[PDB]
Amino acid sequence: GPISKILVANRSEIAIRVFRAANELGIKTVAIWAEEDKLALHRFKADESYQVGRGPHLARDLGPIESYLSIDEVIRVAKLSGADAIHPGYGLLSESPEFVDACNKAGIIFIGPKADTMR
């Protein structure tokens, strides 16, 4: 099944960069945003977008950056949105093998190299 919806597990310029590529290729896009980024540009730049880091499913509010660093939150969003692939951009969870493994686990294409490659 060719890649049909990408979630971009990032913010700012690089989220926006990836949204452009996917969109030019005919691929739908999902953004995530923490509460502190509820007014950020990048979140209005995707086909649809969802909040990470607060709500019923969490013991406490996640911090502004911590919300983007949560593996469970990204995965939870890829499922809720029905994304088939995730772009980590740069920084954040882009060099996490625990993150790569989580994506494998849920059958979501990690747009990056294999977990063994990151170790």
Partner: protein, 46 residues
């Protein structure tokens, strides 16, 4: 507005009603100011 299209809306202020009997509500929508004008039916205005 839809799954995955979240508006943030702040009621900044509400004006005294004017003559012609209009009230303007000053909102912020996703950070941006927006004024909306509504009749003040409560209080007799068309």
């Amino acid at each position: 507005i839809e799954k995955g299209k979240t508006l943030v809306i702040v009621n900044q202020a509400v004006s005294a009603t004017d003559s012609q009997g209009m009230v303007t509500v000053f909102f912020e929508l996703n950070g941006q100011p927006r004024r909306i004008k509504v009749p003040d039916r409560a209080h007799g205005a068309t």
